Structure 1
Amino acid sequence: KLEITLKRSLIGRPQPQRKTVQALGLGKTNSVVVKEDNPAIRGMITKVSHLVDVKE
């Protein structure tokens, strides 16, 4: 598993990034999510790594 925290804002960020975030299950900043380590999920990571911190 891995822990996904939303540290940057979505304001000024394109809707693809926003939708990736909402699909990860994130809302407000400094919000935490715990997910599996599927490559599907790692793709959402690698599309929004600039907004996110990942822990395992």
Structure 2
Amino acid sequence: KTMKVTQLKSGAHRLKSHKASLKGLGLRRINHSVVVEDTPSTRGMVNRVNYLVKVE
């Protein structure tokens, strides 16, 4: 199964590992929405940056 993740806030001034969680999710800019498999490993990346992304 997959899920939709959208970037809502800038990733530009965040921690290095938070920028890397955005990169590992595949999110590149504000309002960008990607489809990614809904696994615990991708859910952990969403949880690392959950303040700046939202899951539809």
TM-score (ref. length: structure 2): 0.91
**Separation (CA, whole Å) in 1 of partners of 2:47 and 2:29:** 20
Q: What secondary structure, in the 3-state scheme, does the structure 2 residue paired with 1:26 have?
A: coil
Structure 2 match to 1:43:
44
User: Unpaired segments of 5 or more residues in structure 1?
Assistant: none
Q: Which amino acid aligns with 2:41?
A: A
State how many pairs are aligned.
55
TM-score (ref. length: structure 1): 0.91
Give the fraction of aligned pairs with identical amino acids, expressed as a percent. 35
**Separation (CA, whole Å) in 2 of partners of 1:37 and 1:13:** 24
Residue deviations 1:7-56 (CA, integer Å, cap 9, x gap): 0001221111001101111111100100111100000011110010101x
Higher helix share: 1
User: Unpaired segments of 5 or more residues in structure 2?
Assistant: none
Q: Which amino acid aligns with 2:3?
A: L
Q: What secondary structure, in the 3-state scheme, does the structure 1 residue paired with 2:49 have?
A: helix
Query: Which runs of structure 2 are paired with 1:13-52 in the superposition (5 Å)?
Result: 13-52=14-53
The CA RMSD over aligned residues, in Å, is 0.8
